[PDB]
Amino acid sequence: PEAYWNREQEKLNRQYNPILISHLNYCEPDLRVTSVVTGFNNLPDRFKDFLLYLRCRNYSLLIDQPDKCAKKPFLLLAIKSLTPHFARRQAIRESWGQESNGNQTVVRVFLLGQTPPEDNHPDLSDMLKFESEKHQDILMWNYRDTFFNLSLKEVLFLRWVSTSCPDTEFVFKGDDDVFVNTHHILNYLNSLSKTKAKDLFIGDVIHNAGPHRDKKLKYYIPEVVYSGLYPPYAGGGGFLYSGHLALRLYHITDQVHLYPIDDVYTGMCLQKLGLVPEKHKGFRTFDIENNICSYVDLMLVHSRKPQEMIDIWSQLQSAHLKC
Ligand SMILES: *[C@@H]1O[C@H](CO)[C@@H](O[C@@H]2O[C@H](CO)[C@@H](O[C@@H]3O[C@H](CO)[C@@H](O)[C@H](O)[C@@H]3O)[C@H](O)[C@H]2NC(C)=O)[C@H](O)[C@H]1NC(C)=O
Ligand SMILES: *[C@@H]1O[C@H](CO)[C@@H](O)[C@H](O)[C@H]1NC(C)=O
Ligand SMILES: [Cl-]
Ligand SMILES: [Cl-]
């Protein structure tokens, strides 16, 4: 196996089939990638950091909401966000991300990493703390919140679900620029039979995909780093799954090396469990933009601005009448 990820994952498979934890807590830079990865020095900076710190995922929680799931939630909303996105998070709080309760309790968390000053980010830590005290929906870990560290955001969130919210019935994970018709989510979840609910995982699933080889593309992956195809994976900006599956997914994450694209990593983890994400037409990653009617029978639409999220949500409340 010439590609680095394939070779490391293959060695990891041998580790987890022992005869008859250094890839999870080794947080010093793995200077070995310098020599074994051909052309390491001309790879972009994001690939260098990813390869160097691939074996470290024991990052701690700087901001936590321990009593978030004191009450068994029916649906846990887990929204990926960045420190400066105060308006996106607030618009979500006021529209589709509203918490609720009586057997259908809805709880909300925002998943943040660090935007550290050493990367020239403006110091917004005081406002972030003020926001966390006021809305109590901020979870923040001490890792650099970057594009290629989104798999870390995934794994660390699944860890938090395991320790702090293991009894949530269902989990929705999505981006902070996606509108979610949470009314339609709850209706769909309530309609599920017990067999389909237990290992539920639906989204905008992509089949027969592979790494983009064009260096200019955002999702570009060099052949040096990864070879082969991509598993079926839910992409876009949101997928929905059962809490039972989340607990299974987290325990398999140790057996799968982190991958630079977090959605592919989640698809990989599903493949390791022998599961297949289910494609649902209601997840329209793909839809630019009146027509409130499309919004009643959708589950989520990517993507929307803060103002649009509130505008669509207010309209959506009167849509059973109009549409
Ligand atoms: C994902 O997040 C982790 C956690 O923040 C990042 O790891 C950190 O990476 C930086 C490099 O940007 C490391 O800083 C370097 O440390 C060496 C130590 O000798 C120093 O010589 C350099 O000048 C630089 O300061 C930092 O140690 C490391 N932190 C931990 C806890 O491992 C990682 O880079 C992120 N990955 C991506 C792809 O962004
Ligand atoms: C991970 O664990 C090792 C060994 O316990 C520790 O030295 C390291 O600082 C930990 N990593 C982080 C990011 O805390
Ligand atoms: Cl502090
Ligand atoms: Cl914002």
Numbering used by the authors: 55 to 74, 90 to 170, 172 to 359, 364 to 397
Sentences from the paper on this structure:
β1,3-N-acetylglucosaminyltransferases (B3GNTs) are Golgi-resident glycosyltransferases involved in the biosynthesis of poly-N-acetyl-lactosamine chains. They catalyze the addition of the N-acetylglucosamine to the N-acetyl-lactosamine repeat as a key step of the chain elongation process. Among the characterized B3GNTs, B3GNT2 is the major poly-N-acetyl-lactosamine synthase, and deletion of its coding gene dramatically reduced the cell surface poly-N-acetyl-lactosamine and led to hypersensitive and hyperresponsive immunocytes. The luminal domain of B3GNT2 comprises an N-terminal helical domain (Pro55–Cys125) and a C-terminal catalytic domain (Cys138–Cys397) as well as an extended linker (Arg126–Lys137) that connects the helical domain to the catalytic domain.
To capture the conformations of the enzyme during the entire reaction cycle, we also determined two more structures of B3GNT2: unliganded and bound to only UDP (for the state when GlcNAcβ1-3Galβ1-4GlcNAc is released). Comparison of the unliganded structure to the substrate-bound or the product-bound structure demonstrates that the substrate-binding cleft of apo B3GNT2 is available to accommodate substrates for the reaction to occur. Nevertheless, some subtle conformational changes in the cleft have been observed at different stages of the reaction cycle. One example is the catalytic residue Asp333 aforementioned. The side chain of Asp333 points away in apo B3GNT2 but rotates to engage the substrates upon binding of either the donor or the acceptor substrate. It stays engaged after the reaction and only to disengage after the release of the product GlcNAcβ1-3Galβ1-4GlcNAc.
